Design a protein around this ligand. Structure first.
Ligand SMILES: Nc1ncnc2c1ncn2[C@@H]1O[C@H](COP(=O)(O)OP(=O)(O)O)[C@@H](O)[C@H]1O
Ligand SMILES: [Mg+2]
Ligand SMILES: [Mg+2]
Length: 327
């Protein structure tokens, strides 16, 4: 007789809501076609034009929503769509405003008792730039009373501004290293300027001496974290590439203390899929950056695991109200 596995048939609908840059990227396509393998799950990718120009009432329906902010994304709308349709939300939307502010990110990490660099916030009133309390010496700064000896790190308050400066002490040749979002072959450049920036609000923080690499961590729920290291952008300024122009990736195995950081970051920020940075310095591991939704690129295993985990999260959560058989 018939061998056909009969249609469910109410599929659980997973909606993907993000800018087309992200929704159509290779890592996204790899992960979604694997999620589509789940018998009871169908993936609806929200068109960018819909997201941008249609009110939320005409956005397609879903049972589970994967949505995340990137440049130009209408987060207000994503949030009103979530309130309207009450779907199961994978990466919390309101947390994503906070993730855009480095002050908020650091406040959350502090409150969760996660090791991060010693730091101070200089808020500059754009109309009274002199008022703000900053005192600068040759090899130090004083922000809100607290003192930072060069080498120190200076970060724009907006987490979406990647113009992070690190200041060299007199004995290292002076000047600064200017980090910026990498296009081209440079990740940073030397500058002879020794005085800190004079407009804008910044976080000043202690420089964590590492071995010249950054540990990049990518979570998929609290019990899964992939890690790899990359050359610190402040080092050569040169991006290292391999055979095929792919950046070079150093091996990392997270220790127990670090697996717990990943578990806590994932939950504290309410982002199932979450990328953050670790600085392995002085026997410990400091989080310096939390970026929210992020895929690993060019890893078959990560694609398989990510899709398997997300798929299972959806099933576990929504199978019961649908009366779908699942353990
Ligand atoms: N406190 C620090 N000590 C040493 N290096 C740091 C420190 N803060 C950040 N860095 C270097 O600056 C790079 C960029 O800083 P990060 O906080 O990740 O900003 P971004 O959001 O633009 O990625 C980090 O990956 C790291 O290599
Ligand atoms: Mg970073
Ligand atoms: Mg960042």
């Amino acid at each position: 007789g018939s061998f056909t596995d009969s249609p469910p048939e109410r599929q659980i609908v997973v909606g993907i809501c993000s800018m087309a840059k992200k929704s159509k990227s290779k890592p996204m396509k790899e992960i979604l076609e694997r999620i589509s393998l789940f018998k009871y799950i169908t993936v609806v990718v929200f068109e960018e034009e819909v997201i941008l120009n249609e009110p939320v009432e005409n956005w397609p329906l879903c049972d589970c929503l994967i949505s995340f902010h990137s440049k130009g994304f209408p987060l207000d709308k994503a949030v009103a769509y979530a309130k309207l349709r009450n779907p199961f939300v994978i990466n919390d939307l309101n947390m994503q405003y906070l993730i855009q502010d480095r002050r908020e990110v650091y406040s959350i990490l502090q409150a969760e008792g996660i090791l991060l660099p010693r730091y101070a916030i200089l808020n500059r009133d754009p109309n009274n730039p002199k008022e703000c309390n900053l005192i600068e010496g040759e090899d130090h700064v004083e922000v809100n009373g607290e003192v930072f000896q060069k080498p120190f790190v200076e970060k724009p308050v907006s987490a979406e501004d990647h113009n992070v400066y690190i200041y060299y002490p007199t004995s290292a040749g002076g000047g600064s290293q200017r980090l910026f979002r990498k296009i081209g072959s440079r990740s940073s450049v030397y500058s002879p300027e020794s005085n800190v920036r004079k407009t804008g609000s910044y976080i000043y923080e202690e420089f964590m001496p590492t071995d010249g690499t950054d540990v990049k961590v990518y979570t998929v729920g609290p019990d899964y974290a992939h890690a790899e290291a990359r050359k610190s952008p402040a080092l050569d300024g040169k991006v290292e590439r391999d055979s095929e122009g792919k950046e070079v990736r150093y091996p990392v195995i997270l220790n127990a203390r670090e697996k717990l950081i990943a578990w806590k970051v994932c939950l504290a920020f309410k982002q199932t899929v979450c990328g953050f940075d670790l600085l392995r310095a002085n026997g410990q591991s400091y989080v310096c950056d939390v970026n929210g939704f992020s895929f690993v690129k060019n890893s078959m295993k990560y694609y398989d695991d990510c899709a398997k985990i997300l798929g299972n999260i959806v099933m576990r959560e929504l199978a019961p109200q649908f009366h779908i058989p699942w353990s």
